[PDB]
């Protein structure tokens, strides 16, 4: 089964999903411009029709301790991958941002 | 409530479930009753372990004696005891010298704990 952080990453690397979730251009920091839409797909991907952002964010908060994703204090719906995405993806934030043409 | 004898002829304790979920509050507050006379205010500490976990992580494993009773407030077991295996409690009443009472195969701690068939 795919994990929430892996799914989010999957969305952040797909140009089409940029309208509801994208990088902020600051490292691996990203914001969910449409949390309801992200939640819908997450629940759809996990087969949990009653899934909503409320519940999804709770999953994210469970990442705080496991140091996979942290919250950007003060920025609504803005989180950040704190694991080694560069090693996994093989690209640095700068490159990936360019590749995905993040304006 | 109902007490149980410990490996020490001087102390008793409340009954703990045979199986429980880790970090989950126990069904009944743990207590250590002293047979003999123990000074009020005496510290009582508890620890656990076995051949799979030499020292399990616990929560609130400290309590003070009061009228021969050391009432532990929300003692939890965080470390797991292993499939089938169980923990060996080591109760320690701090006196001069310290008196320690164990209790083998006391409680089995796992991630899910008691679960109904699926």
């Amino acid at each position: 089964p795919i994990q929430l952080w892996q799914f989010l990453l999957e969305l952040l690397t797909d140009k089409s999903c940029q309208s509801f979730i994208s990088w902020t251009g600051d490292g691996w920091e990203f914001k969910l411009s449409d949390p309801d839409e992200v939640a819908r797909r997450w629940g759809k991907r996990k087969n949990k029709p009653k899934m909503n952002y409320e519940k999804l964010s709770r999953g994210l908060r469970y990442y705080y301790d496991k140091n996979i994703i942290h919250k950007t204090a003060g920025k609504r719906y803005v989180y950040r991958f704190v694991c080694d995405l560069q090693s996994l993806l093989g690209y640095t934030p700068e490159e990936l941002h360019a590749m995905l043409d993040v304006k | 409530g109902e007490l149980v004898r410990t490996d020490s002829p001087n102390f008793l304790c409340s009954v703990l479930p045979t199986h429980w979920r880790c970090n989950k509050t126990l069904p009944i507050a743990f207590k250590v009753v002293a047979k003999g006379d123990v000074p009020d205010g005496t510290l009582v500490t508890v620890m656990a372990g076995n051949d799979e976990n030499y020292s399990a992580e616990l929560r609130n494993a400290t309590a003070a004696m009061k009228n021969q009773v050391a009432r532990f407030n929300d003692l939890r077991f965080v470390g797991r005891s292993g499939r089938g295996k169980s923990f060996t409690l080591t109760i320690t009443v701090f006196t001069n010298p310290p008196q320690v009472a164990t209790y083998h195969r006391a409680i089995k701690i796992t991630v899910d704990g008691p679960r109904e068939p699926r």
Binding site: - | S8, P9, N10, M47, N50, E52, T88, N96, P97
Partner: protein, 132 residues
């Protein structure tokens, strides 16, 4: 009843004690959730206070140790000279109605070593008296 009548016997018969009479492997049970660095400074400084938490890895039996005489940091009880780094501690206690003396060493770096339980002749006697 702080002790069992057959104090001398219980120790020489009961499996529990016998299994912990040899030089069983011991280890520091303190702060297993903190950096090794901290577990070192903690384990040491605490020893200077005449206390530490040790458990016999093999059997998994934990013990809270207090390095002081049956009654100010001691000297003979908590040794730190007998060997560079290594630390030879000693602490009496009434384990399951049986007066005994814990003894063993620990690597001031690795935070583990060996130890055992030797019956306590005197304390046993004295105790049996106070209980008559």
């Amino acid at each position: 009843p702080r002790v069992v009548p057959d104090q001398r016997s219980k120790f020489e018969n009961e499996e529990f004690f016998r299994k912990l009479s040899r030089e069983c492997e011991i280890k520091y049970t303190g702060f297993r959730d903190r950096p090794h660095e901290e577990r070192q400074t903690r384990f040491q400084n605490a020893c200077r206070d005449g206390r530490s938490e040790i458990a016999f890895v093999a059997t998994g039996t934990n013990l809270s140790l207090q390095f002081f005489p049956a009654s100010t940091p001691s000297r003979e009880y908590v040794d730190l000279e007998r060997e560079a780094g290594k630390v030879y501690l000693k602490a009496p206690m009434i384990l399951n109605g049986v007066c005994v003396i814990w003894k063993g060493w620990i690597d001031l770096h690795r935070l583990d070593g060996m130890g055992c339980l030797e019956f306590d002749e005197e304390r046993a006697q004295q105790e049996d008296a106070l209980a008559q």
